[PDB]
DNA sequence: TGCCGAGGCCGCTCAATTGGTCGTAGACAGCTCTAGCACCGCTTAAACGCACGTACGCGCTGTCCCCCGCGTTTTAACCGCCAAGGGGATTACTCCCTAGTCTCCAGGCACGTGTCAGATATATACATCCTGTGCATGTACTCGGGATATTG
């Protein structure tokens, strides 16, 4: 059901194992990388195919 | 110079108040009482308030005559302060005991009536006690002079 899911990187980017979404958008970036890293790979992980 | 070190602005996360929403339980408002006994209305023969010179009692008044007030300033320590130290008032926790709930259960006594008496009120006659008045001394007072106590 849900399309879409709104969230801060600090707060959702640690442990959050969102597999089922099949994409990531940045509507900004912050000047650590890592944290971005972070955000990205809590969707990219051995669950998804 | 350098470096950097120290420096100054902005999103998480938690922890009281604040206000909101849920649902349910007696307790409030109200009805009909109904029921009855007080309020009222209606007389009466009743007490006690009250509008009203005058005798006259004292509240208020025109005088002079003095201490205590009124004014000054030195000082005197009283009272305020700050800062430090010690503990004891305080805080936060864990174990513990009973405060509190309910429930059953009885009879103590506070409740209520049922009768009718020793009580105290009221009158009349009255004598007596008590008040208001008038009337001596006896003291408690104000003063002066000296002894004892106490402050500086």
Redesign the pocket.
């Given at each position: 059901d849900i399309f879409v899911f709104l969230l801060?990187?600090?707060?959702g980017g640690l442990g959050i194992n969102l597999t089922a979404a099949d994409t990531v958008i940045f509507y900004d970036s912050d000047w650590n990388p890592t944290v971005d890293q972070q955000a990205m790979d809590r969707a990219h992980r051995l669950g998804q195919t």
């Open positions: 801060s990187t600090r707060a």
